[PDB]
Design a protein around this ligand. Structure first.
Ligand SMILES: *[C@@H]1O[C@H](CO)[C@@H](O[C@@H]2O[C@H](CO)[C@@H](O[C@@H]3O[C@H](CO[C@H]4O[C@H](CO)[C@@H](O)[C@H](O)[C@@H]4O)[C@@H](O)[C@H](O[C@H]4O[C@H](CO)[C@@H](O)[C@H](O)[C@@H]4O)[C@@H]3O)[C@H](O)[C@H]2NC(C)=O)[C@H](O)[C@H]1NC(C)=O
Ligand SMILES: C[C@H](N)[C@H](C(=O)N1CCC2(CC1)Oc1ccccc1O2)c1ccc(Cl)cc1
Ligand SMILES: CCCCCCCCO[C@@H]1O[C@H](CO)[C@@H](O)[C@H](O)[C@H]1O
Ligand SMILES: CCCCCCCCO[C@@H]1O[C@H](CO)[C@@H](O)[C@H](O)[C@H]1O
Ligand SMILES: *C(=O)CCCCCCCCCCCCCCC
Length: 326
């Protein structure tokens, strides 16, 4: 008996003292001191001030630079858009509610902010999956007469939207649900209550397998094969100093991407492991929300790694910031 249940919410605090209030009606300052809600606000401000420009600039320099508009880059624009859903559907709403100390938009606002913030993060996730599939296809050439073009790259983007809707949309119609989470200032999928009426258990399993396990396997396989192919090819051309240089930098970049993905991925896996063993206790506000706190920062560091470290975008972005010169 660690928390307080109500219709459409679960406050991770016991009501034995009678102080708990609906997170839709009154501030949750028994979960956390006001200054900690402010620090939640400050963190959201940081993510907005870094996350909007980087992702907006990614869309903006693609409009100004013809050479960026290649099919292999479409999935990166999708990534930028997904991050902006997170920045505006998620961080902005949470900055605003955090300063009230509760989710001031009510259960309807909870579904909206939950849906769009879950959709944004899901589209990003699957964009990294699809980008890895695309790079694997282009480099390892597993179809003999195949050339990756505009129509294929559109399919990849559409695919991320289907996968993201497949996670974000069921809680809207009765499989899982959106509720306040953590300090009750933002809304998300309910993996926190063993709700039976909406079959929460099977959605968590389905999330775990399809939207957590499968992405990691596909990302590791595609990039593993790719590094193997590039090393193998470079080994056959050891007379080419640039081939060796290119190999070293492809390898080093895959390592950064995979480690970045694990930095986002392992906190969920560590916390989920706690859920299987050490089931006994129930704990909050944080909880499995430690990964979520840090997974939000992927709206900032993913564009840094996949876009800002891409040689083309960097030079185009410099040209654009410097009003066309240098
Ligand atoms: C966590 O736990 C707390 C404590 O149990 C819950 O808060 C209580 O919620 C109940 C309602 O479910 C509140 O009861 C209602 O309070 C109203 C005002 O009561 C105060 O004001 C009157 C003057 O009007 C004083 O005389 C009185 O002494 C109180 O100080 C009333 O309007 C309500 O009355 C109606 O309902 C009752 C039954 O509940 C009927 O019998 C009546 O006829 C009347 O129609 C009722 O009294 C209670 O005040 C809350 N307590 C506190 C401390 O806030 C939380 O709901 C719970 N949290 C969650 C998330 O569930
Ligand atoms: C919506 C998000 N795109 C997605 C996410 O937050 N969820 C909820 C948390 C998650 C993975 C899926 O579910 C679980 C269920 C039980 C145990 C642990 C769990 O971890 C997500 C997917 C991958 C990554 Cl690396 C980050 C986040
Ligand atoms: C590397 C790409 C991974 C993207 C991870 C996205 C992080 C989103 O984090 C998610 O936020 C949602 C609402 O904000 C909540 O429903 C989830 O509890 C939380 O895991
Ligand atoms: C998702 C898959 C990530 C693959 C990263 C592989 C990292 C390998 O790293 C490489 O290993 C070689 C030996 O195999 C060494 O000779 C190289 O110095 C080293 O760069
Ligand atoms: C050429 O590529 C650059 C043109 C001139 C740019 C110089 C101004 C950049 C300032 C960036 C720092 C903003 C700080 C804001 C902190 C809140």
């Amino acid at each position: 008996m660690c928390g307080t249940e109500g219709p459409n919410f679960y406050v991770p605090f016991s009501n034995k003292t009678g102080v708990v209030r609906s997170p839709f009606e009154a501030p949750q300052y028994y979960l956390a001191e006001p200054w900690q809600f402010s620090m939640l606000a400050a963190y959201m401000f940081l993510l907005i001030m870094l996350g909007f420009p980087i992702n907006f600039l990614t869309l903006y320099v693609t409009v100004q630079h013809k050479k960026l508009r290649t099919p292999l880059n479409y999935i990166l624009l999708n990534l930028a858009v997904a991050d902006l859903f997170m920045v505006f559907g998620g961080f902005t709403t949470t900055l605003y509610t955090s300063l009230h100390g509760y989710f001031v938009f009510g259960p309807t606002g909870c579904n909206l902010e939950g849906f769009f913030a879950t959709l944004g993060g899901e589209i990003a996730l699957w964009s990294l999956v699809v980008l890895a599939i695309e790079r694997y296809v282009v480099v390892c050439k597993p179809m003999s007469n195949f050339r990756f073009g505009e129509n294929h790259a559109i399919m990849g983007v559409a695919f991320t939207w289907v996968m993201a809707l497949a996670c974000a949309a069921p809680p809207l119609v009765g499989w899982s649900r959106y509720i306040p989470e953590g300090m009750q200032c933002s809304c998300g999928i309910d993996y926190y209550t063993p709700h039976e009426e909406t079959n929460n258990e099977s959605f968590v399993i389905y999330m775990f397998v399809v939207h957590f396990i499968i992405p990691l396997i596909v990302i590791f396989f595609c990039y593993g094969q790719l590094v193997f192919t590039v090393k193998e090819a470079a080994a056959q051309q050891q007379e080419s100093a640039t081939t060796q240089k290119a190999e070293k930098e492809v390898t080093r970049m895959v390592i950064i991407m995979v480690i970045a993905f694990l930095i986002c991925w392992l906190p969920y896996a560590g916390v989920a492991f706690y859920i299987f063993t050490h089931q006994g206790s129930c704990f909050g506000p944080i909880f499995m929300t430690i990964p979520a706190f840090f997974a939000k920062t992927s709206a900032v560091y993913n564009p840094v790694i996949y876009i800002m470290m891409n040689k083309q975008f960097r030079n185009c972005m410099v040209t654009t910031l410097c009003c066309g010169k240098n």
